[PDB]
Design a protein around this nucleic acid. Structure first.
Lengths: 117, 31, 95, 272, 87, 63
RNA sequence: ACUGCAGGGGAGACUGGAAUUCCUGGUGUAGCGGUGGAAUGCGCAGAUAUCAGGAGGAACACCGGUGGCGAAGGCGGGUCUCUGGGCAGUAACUGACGCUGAGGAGCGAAAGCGUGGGGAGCGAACAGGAUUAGAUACCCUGGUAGUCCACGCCGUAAACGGUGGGUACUAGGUGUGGGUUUCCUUCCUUGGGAUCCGUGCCGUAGCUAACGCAUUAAGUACCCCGCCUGGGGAGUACGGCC
């Protein structure tokens, strides 16, 4: 337990899950990855509502240490990143660096095949 | 469609190849 | 006789310490081979778009040598083996 | 670099042999040649410990310079490349400018008149021998001693090489051919390059006699011995053993390394 | 390199005179030069089979030209052969 | 549209300020049609940018 | 031949990096991962996540397109050595030396095969779970061979424009690539126009069973080569070559 002058949010969403966690700009963990702690299974945990709950619980973890400003590094296409953004705003912490860090690898690895409906 | 013209040959070669994979050995090799 | 533009990168500290020596030490070798040195111009030091494992800032060395390609390939070899040589680029001057 | 023998006799179908193209027609210097003799696999007590070293063929050996000391800014010229019976590699004869004939394992296609540098201020052009501390990472070397002045012990055979994976405060990260990673004292000497004779693995020895010429005896299977002589022996119906693979004296084919060996502070990654 | 220098020196030796580019002899001589340099290239790398195709075409030209010569003269034919050597 | 009467001095990699106008904020390559360029100059640029990027005059991804 | 121009044309050598996987360490924890839904599985021995650092293999985003080059298959991460081909203008040279081309020789994706290396990710086979009446298939997990490299073999495919090659000629227009050159000669436009190649579209005639083609003809017309002559049995058998 320590005071946080400033944090570093990382958010990654998917089409079956999303995570929200706050790291230290130094490079360690402040706030445990909050999604999944809601009792959701399967495609349920990917939903925006889950994103809201994860954001809220992240804020609770955030104030268990004490922070008011956390930069935002979001990636991972999913069910709506902005739901988490707005819920964190509802928690009311300074956004700071809102800009995404969405990976865009140059064309290397051959992808897998889930192309069978 | 015009594909019909191709299918008969598709099947024919298939049974040929299948028939020989069934014998790539002394079953056929001896002869 | 193969006008080439040659660019070399390094920590500016060593550049100021060895402005000429660290360059002449091989440019003279090229001359021994029978080459032609045009420039040693440096655009001071500059920040890199990204850190090359270290040294976020380096230098902008431009040489410009009209030597034989064999001598040049030997030059590049020597330099690339020299730990003070980073991201040497060598470009031709025509089609 | 291998000619294949033509099928004529039944014993020589796929048999092959190196062309010896790199070999100059030259005999060894008597000042360096030293004798030796076969001992089979017999020790000082007259008992056989290694069961396949008997027989062979009359052979000499050469005083190879590994503790390279004459290197204080002194160059050397390659004169001849000679065949070395005791090694899969081939050797090169170096003449020092001050007058001295020494043999050393040749790395690449060295030839008569190739100037070799040595010491500390030499470049790392193949053939030079200088300490790891002065060699940049990301290259291959050979003939590496494990101790300052202790003599080259790693990577001496054909195709052997050690890749440098960076340096420590006073140690150096070496990648051996097996894939193991080891930290060694940076003051150790090393010969740059690799042994460019990488064809022995592609030589199929043919008829048995070539291995009997070399010095390898038959390796009798354990199963066919009788029980008192080997654990897997005996039986009626050409069985295998009745328990599992062991040596003739009862030792599982497991890890024999002494776990408390005084090298675990240097070994950091094990091979597969 | 197949440069103007090479071309002119060949024309000065095998060629008839300075302004001679229609000469079968001159053209052949230069093609055999291309053969020399390019063949030497093929002695190494042994995979640019596109430039190899180029070689084969040049060989075709050379053969056709000497055939024409076979219909035009035998003295120039033999003289040229004496210079070159048909396998 | 561009490079009309300016066929005297080349660009190469010694004008990152100019090339910045030929790349995105991230530094991604603009199409010929963005500037009305000629293809010869477009490819000259494509090579120039890559070289400058390899010498970290410009980034691969100006994030 | 000369002069200029474009070009991912090819080989070889060197080589950068985003990123993925793995690993060391730190942080911090009970879920991750996955779907149509769900499971198998992964994770409590600290997974995933996240910071830094390290290894290694593969492919090389943006440019990049309707575009370029190549006989074609095919070829676009960079630098560099070597090296092929093509186009315009010039018209210096020869003076029919042209075209085609059975048989023949050579190049020839991917898959596959030999020998040997390499082997990140992916991924036949395979295994397991799910689905289904059943599912040796789809779906998911994990995963061999292989993909990659050195040197060799087989010589196939929509190796397709389902259009052999060359040659000459015949409504136009619109776009595009390369280069040359005129009027506007700066009206700046580097436009319009002429000309040679290549490229994509629409379109007159003509042709075509129709669909459609149409100055890149599937039109007019010559030369050469090649192939068929109902579908199956069959591009298989016997034979012979590789």
């Amino acid at each position: 337990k320590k005071n946080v002058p400033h944090g570093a949010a990382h958010i990654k969403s998917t089409f079956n899950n999303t995570i929200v966690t706050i790291t230290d700009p130094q490079g360690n963990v402040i706030a445990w990855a909050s999604s999944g702690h809601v009792g959701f299974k399967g495609s349920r945990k990917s939903t925006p509502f889950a994103a809201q709950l994860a954001a809220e619980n992240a804020a609770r973890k955030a104030q268990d240490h004490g922070v008011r400003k956390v930069d935002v590094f979001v990636k991972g296409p999913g069910s709506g990143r902005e739901t988490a953004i707005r819920s964190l705003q509802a928690a009311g912490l300074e956004v700071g660096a809102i800009s995404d860090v969405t990976p865009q690898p140059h064309n290397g690895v051959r992808p897998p095949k889930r192309r069978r409906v | 469609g015009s594909v019909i013209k191709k299918r008969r040959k598709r099947m024919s070669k298939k049974k040929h190849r299948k028939l020989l994979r069934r014998t790539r050995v002394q079953r056929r090799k001896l002869g | 006789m193969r006008p080439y533009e040659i660019m070399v990168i390094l920590d500016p500290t060593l550049d100021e310490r060895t402005v000429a020596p660290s360059l002449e030490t091989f440019l003279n070798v090229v001359r021994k081979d029978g080459g032609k040195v045009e420039k040693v111009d440096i655009w001071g030091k500059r920040r890199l778009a990204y850190e090359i494992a270290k040294h976020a800032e380096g230098i902008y060395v431009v040489i410009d040598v009209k030597a034989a390609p064999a001598t040049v390939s030997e030059l590049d070899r020597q330099l690339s083996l020299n730990e003070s040589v980073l991201r040497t680029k060598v470009m031709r001057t025509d089609k | 670099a291998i000619r294949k023998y033509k099928p004529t006799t039944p014993g020589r179908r796929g048999a092959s042999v190196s062309d010896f193209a790199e070999i100059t027609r030259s005999t060894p210097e008597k000042s360096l040649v030293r004798p030796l003799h076969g001992r089979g696999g017999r020790n000082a007590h007259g008992r056989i410990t290694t069961r396949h070293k008997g027989g062979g063929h009359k052979r000499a050996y050469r005083m190879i310079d590994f503790r390279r000391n004459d290197k204080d800014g002194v160059n050397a010229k390659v004169a001849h490349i000679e065949y070395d019976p005791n090694r899969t590699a081939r050797i090169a004869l170096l003449h020092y400018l001050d007058g001295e004939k020494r043999y050393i394992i040749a790395p690449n296609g060295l030839s008569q008149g190739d100037v070799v540098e040595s010491g500390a201020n030499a470049d790392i052009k193949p053939g030079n021998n200088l300490p790891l501390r002065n060699i940049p990472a990301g290259t291959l070397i050979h003939a590496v001693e494990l101790r300052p002045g202790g003599g080259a012990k790693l990577a001496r055979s054909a195709g052997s090489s050690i890749q440098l994976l960076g340096k420590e405060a006073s140690y150096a990260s070496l990648r051996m051919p097996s894939g193991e990673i080891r930290r060694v004292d940076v003051r150790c000497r090393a010969t740059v390059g690799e042994v460019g004779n990488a064809e022995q693995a592609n030589i199929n020895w043919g008829k048995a006699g070539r291995m009997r010429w070399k010095g390898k005896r038959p390796s009798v299977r354990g199963v066919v011995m009788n029980p008192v002589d080997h654990p897997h022996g005996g039986g009626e119906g050409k069985t295998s053993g009745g328990r599992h693979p062991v040596s003739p004296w009862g030792k599982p084919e497991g890890r024999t390394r002494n776990a408390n060996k005084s090298s675990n502070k240097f070994i950091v990654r094990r091979r597969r | 390199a197949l440069t103007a220098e090479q071309k002119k020196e060949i024309l000065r030796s095998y060629g008839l005179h300075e302004t001679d580019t229609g000469s079968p002899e001159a053209q052949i001589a230069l093609l055999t030069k291309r053969i020399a340099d390019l063949t030497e290239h093929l002695k190494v790398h042994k995979h640019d089979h596109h430039s190899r195709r180029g070689l084969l075409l040049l060989v075709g030209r050379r053969r056709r030209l000497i055939k024409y010569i076979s219909q035009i003269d035998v003295e120039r034919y033999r003289s040229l052969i004496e210079r070159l050597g048909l396998r | 549209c561009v490079f009309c009467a300016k066929k005297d001095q080349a660009i190469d990699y010694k004008d990152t300020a100019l090339l910045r106008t030929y790349i995105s904020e991230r530094g991604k390559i603009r199409a010929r049609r963005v500037t009305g360029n000629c293809v010869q100059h477009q490819r000259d640029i494509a090579l120039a940018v890559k070289n400058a990027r390899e010498v970290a005059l410009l980034p691969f991804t100006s994030s």
